[PDB]
Amino acid sequence: LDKEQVIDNALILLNEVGIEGLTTRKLAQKIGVEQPTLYWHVKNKRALLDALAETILQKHHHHVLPLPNETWQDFLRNNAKSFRQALLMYRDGGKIHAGTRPSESQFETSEQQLQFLCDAGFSLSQAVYALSSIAHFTLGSVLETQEHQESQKEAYPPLLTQAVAIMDSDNGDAAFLFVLDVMISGLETVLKSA
């Protein structure tokens, strides 16, 4: 019984029951071990949630550094798309990611992200805010998508009728893409004054 196996099962369970319903007792039962055996790998729910958030990004969020051919704009664009897709992979992915601090495994790439934005001419603060922006917008976008879907069932004015169709018709994709490009334009304007 190794960690990888424990977490692989936890991810399957997460899709079966969601974040609220996910407990260690439930994980222990699914794996077919006693709870004190599981304890060694996952001490509690908070520790489980942390491990899931980190593993989901390890498994699915592959655009964490700029490619050699990439501008900072391209990088932020593809990083955000990669993040969004990773959050969308798993049930309650947005709730899973929320409130997790960077993982020891992520330290070096997160450091190079910050350095890379600094070399582009952002101050450190601005770099941090720029990365925080993508993350928060992507997270809010995903949480809305996921939550809207989960509340399925139990007379709008004209412009609002079209606005609802426009957001729902593609689960927020076009709106995500537009705003991402808007955030990137706005950041270019930040660089342009120095």
**CB of residue 32 to a copy of itself, shortest distance in Å:** 27
Q: Of all helices (H) and strands (E), which one includes residue 67?
A: none
Q: Which one-letter amino acid corresponds to residue 145? A: T
Which residue's structure tokens are 């049930």?
91
**CB of residue 186 to a copy of itself, shortest distance in Å:** 3
Scanning 61-157, the segments in alpha helix (DSSP H) are 72-89, 93-97, 107-119, 124-150
Q: How many residues bind a copy of itself, per CB under 8 A? A: 69
Instruction: Decide whether 5 or 169 has the Cβ nearer to a copy of itself.
Output: 169
Q: Of all helices (H) and strands (E), which one includes residue 156?
A: none
Distance set, CA 143 to CA 59, 78, 185 (Å): 20, 19, 24
Q: Is 102 in the site for a copy of itself (CB under 8 A)?
A: yes
Which residue's structure tokens are 């995903």?
142
Pick from 124, 169, 170, 173: which binds a copy of itself (CB under 8 A)? 124
- Contact positions vs a copy of itself (CB under 8 A): 20, 43-44, 46-47, 94-95, 98-99, 101-102, 104, 107-108, 110-111, 114-115, 118, 124-133, 135-141, 143-144, 146-148, 150-151, 154-160, 162-164, 166-167, 172, 174-175, 178-179, 181-187, 189-190
